[PDB]
Design a protein around this ligand. Structure first.
Ligand SMILES: [Ca+2]
Ligand SMILES: [Ca+2]
Ligand SMILES: [Ca+2]
Ligand SMILES: [Ca+2]
Lengths: 121, 121
């Protein structure tokens, strides 16, 4: 009996996020900016990746859903909304000591690596 | 700078629990019945371990805290309260297909392996 099931990544990301914050660490998220649908300031991307501070003080309206991470943040003082499909989330760790986790591959994220509509009808 | 931090186990256990239940799987918890402070029906322990069904229908007043798992459950029709220190939680998986996780060792649980007071003052 083959059972269909959702990716584990969002649950692991929220687990480590909560653990990091409960221990007063500053949660840093490593993102694959080459993943389709990623919407971040390209000028801050290095080697195809971008590291984001997901602390409560560095983000606004933080959402860690099963399909994506979304929030407002300031870059050089300018507030902008970032949108990150879950497949682009590579790891999350504490800025203070690097403790965290690198998410294991999940084939579903290859299938979901598709460019969404960002323009209105 | 050495940073003190709490064990990750309870966060991982809750992550997998939620993932299992959100995917309609029946969560089974593997417990080390030899760990001090464990309070379970010894008659159901096999090779020093006991497997418990943590589904919403099989448990009552389920608590998955940072230090322990506690709930009421029926064995041969009799309701009894179980208490499981987090250090005794070995793994959690889906009864249906065995998907889940075996918790990694955390030295803190060796230090916490101490017999608590179960009798009143
Ligand atoms: Ca905030
Ligand atoms: Ca948006
Ligand atoms: Ca129940
Ligand atoms: Ca009790």
């Amino acid at each position: 009996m083959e059972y269909k099931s959702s990716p584990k990544r969002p649950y692991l990301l929220r687990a480590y996020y909560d653990w990091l914050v409960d221990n007063s660490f500053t949660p840093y998220l490593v993102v694959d900016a080459t993943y389709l649908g990623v919407n971040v300031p390209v000028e801050y991307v290095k080697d195809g990746q971008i590291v984001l501070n997901l602390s409560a003080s560095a983000t606004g309206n933080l959402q860690l859903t099963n399909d994506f991470i979304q929030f407002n943040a300031r870059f050089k003082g300018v507030s902008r909304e970032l949108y990150i499909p879950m497949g682009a989330a590579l790891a999350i760790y504490a800025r203070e000591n690097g403790d965290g986790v690198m998410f294991e591959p999940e084939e579903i994220y290859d299938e979901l690596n598709i460019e969404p509509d960002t323009e209105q009808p």
